[model samples]
Target: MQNPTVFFDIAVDGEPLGRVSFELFADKVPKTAENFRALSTGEKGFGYKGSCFHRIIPGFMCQGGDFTRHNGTGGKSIYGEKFEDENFILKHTGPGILSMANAGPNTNGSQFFICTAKTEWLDGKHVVFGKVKEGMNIVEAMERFGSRNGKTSKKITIADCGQLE
Candidate 1:
């Protein structure tokens, strides 16, 4: 089956920053991919929309998907509050890779990250489910807002999001 495509229309401190598109690896991680897809479409009435990328590391990754808290502290999976870790069939080999972010093993909820650089240490720990297919420059642009402590000086919000046809 063709992988699903999704997009996030980003905003920085409430200003438009363009869109970033991702292609999910459903064939490798179906459940995880579906969670992201559902969240993107907001069919659940709550998702990435209006949420901010709460954590960002300049040379690492940008993290978000906390629609409940708009920060790293809270988010709920479409499945429930949390779900088991999908297999790590995909690797964090380079920039634009999308993966789940959790407190620990099998604790995945709605939180996820997009790698801004090669992060080999996360290869076996995080569930890599997608990749940015277009507008990576927008992600790169978001990186400029990140500080060393992984906090952004300005809110990087998902102004809008949905699955693409």
Candidate 2:
């Protein structure tokens, strides 16, 4: 079966910006998709709720998913250990594409980034597993409202994120 569509509800400084939904390329990148799914749904504990968008680069991407330390420094997978990188034939072609953020090869752990603009440079460096199905405007808003130093003046949180019915 195809992977189910998921919804990630985002909020900025306690106000709702609605959900940014997407579907994973599980058929192409199974383990990476599973890792993202598990981490965002609390199946791996705490998930992405209350975690801030620790890194936001205007016209680039909005990075988050560090639920453990809230900073961009820490993250753990459902396996309780970091895993290997999955190679794919994907690219950072447009806005709203979701990609893994890692310190180096095979180091992906809860941290992810949502493309707010085209960044072809990230094509081979990060794992592209998902894309925004809705709420591109919210992602755009984050680009306009956030800073380059990975901080948003109005704290954004993933209020709810999981597989949709």
TM-score of each: 0.93, 0.90
- In order, candidate lDDTs are 0.83, 0.76
Report clash pairs, candidate 2: none
Over 4 Å off, model 1: none
What tens digits encode model 1's per-residue C-alpha lDDT throughout 1-165? 789988878898779989988998888888898898888777887755667777888878888777777767768888998888668778887889988888888888878888988888888887787889999999998888898987888877777777886
Worst 10 residues of 1 by lDDT: 45-54
lDDT of candidate 1 at residue 102, scale 0 to 100: 87
Q: For candidate 2, lDDT tens digit of each residue in 1-165?
A: 776567666787688887777778888888888888777667746656656677787767888777778777767888765777677567787778888888877888667888887787777777787898778887888778777776777877777766673
